[PDB]
Amino acid sequence: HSHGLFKKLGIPGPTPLPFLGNILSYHKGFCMFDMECHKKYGKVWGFYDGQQPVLAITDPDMIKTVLVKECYSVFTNRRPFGPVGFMKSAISIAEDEEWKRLRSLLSPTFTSGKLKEMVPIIAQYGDVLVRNLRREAETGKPVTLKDVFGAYSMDVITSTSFGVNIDSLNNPQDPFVENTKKLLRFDFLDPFFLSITVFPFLIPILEVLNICVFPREVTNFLRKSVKRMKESRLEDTVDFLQLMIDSQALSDLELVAQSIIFIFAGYETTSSVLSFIMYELATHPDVQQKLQEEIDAVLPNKAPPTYDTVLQMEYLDMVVNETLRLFPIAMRLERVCKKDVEINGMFIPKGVVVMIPSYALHRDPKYWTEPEKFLPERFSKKNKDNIDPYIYTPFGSGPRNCIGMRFALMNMKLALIRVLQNFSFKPCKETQIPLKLSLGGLLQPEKPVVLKVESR
Ligand code: HEM
Numbered sequence: 001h002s003h004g005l006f007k008k009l010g011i012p013g014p015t016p017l018p019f020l021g022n023i024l025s026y027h028k029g030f031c032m033f034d035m036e037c038h039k040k041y042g043k044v045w046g047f048y049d050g051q052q053p054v055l056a057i058t059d060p061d062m063i064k065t066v067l068v069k070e071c072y073s074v075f076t077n078r079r080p081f082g083p084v085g086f087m088k089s090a091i092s093i094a095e096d097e098e099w100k101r102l103r104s105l106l107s108p109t110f111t112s113g114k115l116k117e118m119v120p121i122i123a124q125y126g127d128v129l130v131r132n133l134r135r136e137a138e139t140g141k142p143v144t145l146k147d148v149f150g151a152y153s154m155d156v157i158t159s160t161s162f163g164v165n166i167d168s169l170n171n172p173q174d175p176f177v178e179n180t181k182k183l184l185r186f187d188f189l190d191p192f193f194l195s196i197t198v199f200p201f202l203i204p205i206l207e208v209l210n211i212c213v214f215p216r217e218v219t220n221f222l223r224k225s226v227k228r229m230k231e232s233r234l235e236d237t238v239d240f241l242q243l244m245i246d247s248q249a250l251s252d253l254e255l256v257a258q259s260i261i262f263i264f265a266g267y268e269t270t271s272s273v274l275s276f277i278m279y280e281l282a283t284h285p286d287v288q289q290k291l292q293e294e295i296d297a298v299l300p301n302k303a304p305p306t307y308d309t310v311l312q313m314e315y316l317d318m319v320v321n322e323t324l325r326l327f328p329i330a331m332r333l334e335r336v337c338k339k340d341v342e343i344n345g346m347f348i349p350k351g352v353v354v355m356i357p358s359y360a361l362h363r364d365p366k367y368w369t370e371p372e373k374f375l376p377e378r379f380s381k382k383n384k385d386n387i388d389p390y391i392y393t394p395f396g397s398g399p400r401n402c403i404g405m406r407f408a409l410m411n412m413k414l415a416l417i418r419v420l421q422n423f424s425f426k427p428c429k430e431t432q433i434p435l436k437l438s439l440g441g442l443l444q445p446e447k448p449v450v451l452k453v454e455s456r
């Protein structure tokens with residue numbers, strides 16, 4: 001048993017059980033477990049995912065060292081998670097040299113120039129989202145946001161990876177829609193991933209059986225989807241595909257891996273955050289009116305948002321950020337400790353997963369006044385400098401942060417601008433209040449957010 005380590009290092013934690021470790025404590029969610037631990041062990045503590053020692057850390061300096069300083073030398077990778085197949089090459093999964101190589105090649109993809117070039121595209125599906133919303137605002141029946149936002153999010157993804165101009169909501173049965181939709185993942189507390197942690201010694205076994213967490217089903221029709229366009233569309237002579245093609249040491253059957261992860265990364269994420277935001281504005285009509293006014297002051301007479309226009313919206317940026325404080329989609333940030341180290345006084349042995357509890361740190365009394373309340377003013381220029389960048393980490397930090405940050409932000413904002421210009425979102429009878437979060441390992445709502453939509 002490796003279960004003696006935190007006792008021996010003099011680190012407090014909940015007492016692990018044989019084989020299971022502390023996993024049974026997840027029955028309440030990463031979220032309440034991390035908050036409880038913080039509350040009763042203080043700044044630093046230790047637990048076991050099966051036989052895997054995880055060290056939680058909460059000190060801004062120490063986090064900065066793990067996330068930003070010793071990233072390259074010591075804390076380079078995330079923890080392996082289950083049988084991954086060819087997706088071992090995807091940037092967010094890759095390790096060491098291979099990761100450093102991929103992050104360089106793909107960095108040019110997420111530049112402001114490429115992003116400004118992507119505006120007219122993502123924006124054009126703002127109009128579709130509106131159109132679509134306009135029909136359902138005439139029904140007067142509760143809208144399921146995550147579904148309307150889902151279609152928008154797919155729509156924006158497809159289009160910025162080799163223009164696949166699909167009206168995703170109203171082409172429910174299109175090859176690109178059906179596959180992509182199914183790439184809704186991953187819950188690391190579901191039955192499957194649970195066993196993966198009580199039995200990591202089973203991963204080698206499933207890998208050799210070709211069993212993959214990214215279901216073979218989906219990855220198949222994308223490997224093949226990509227193969228023909230990549231060859232045909234530029235044989236006759238503005239998207240991630242092109243940007244990728246041009247920069248060719250980037251292997252063929254690694255480009256597919258990047259392509260899949262950008263779908264898997266923006267699809268469920270952009271749509272979830274957006275839902276959480278529209279929930280927040282509905283249950284906060286004041287904020288929503290304040291927002292609609294900012295937008296109308298900047299873009300008078302429903303004028304179409306632009307790149308520069310979007311950045312100019314102080315209050316929009318504040319609403320987005322607050323929503324991310326309350327519902328960070330990562331929940332935790334993790335790095336594997338590559339060799340023995342001494343960071344800000346304390347010793348980390350090689351092999352330990354070092355873990356920063358974002359969801360918990362985002363809700364900590366030491367840093368936030370009335371931390372349960374949705375209050376966008378915390379992010380106004382008056383108060384924002386009191387906000388520590390290593391407590392508030394919705395996009396991680398350091399060399400291994402979210403490569404898609406500015407794209408995520410811009411995308412989401414463009415959706416909000418076009419949507420708020422045209423509609424108001426009011427809660428109805430089916431709407432859950434206060435919103436309850438899911439007990440799983442994906443931070444999402446128990447019941448899908450349903451809201452009344454009214455035409456301005
Ligand atoms: C609102 C939506 C999003 C949120 C809240 C978000 C947040 C994050 C967070 C917290 C990390 C971990 C960083 C760390 O360990 O410090 C991350 C990693 C990453 N994200 Fe984003 N993300 C979002 C959307 C995107 C989009 C749109 C893309 C690209 C299309 C993207 C691509 C990545 C990649 C490739 C990594 C791993 C980076 C690496 O290992 O080098 N995510 N995301």
Ligand SMILES: CC[C@@H](CC[C@H](CC)NC(=O)[C@H](CO)NC(=O)N(C)Cc1csc(C(C)C)n1)NC(=O)OCc1cncs1
Pocket residue numbers: 049078079080081092093186188197261264265266269329330331332333334402441442443
């Ligand atoms: C394939 C899993 C995951 C890899 C990296 C993400 C980044 C947010 N990691 C996570 O934070 C997610 C939680 O939503 N999962 C994890 O926390 N892990 C990968 C670690 C893990 C694996 S098992 C476990 C339990 C047993 C304690 N923890 N997704 C992924 O590929 O990133 C695409 C995205 C980019 N931006 C937002 S999502």
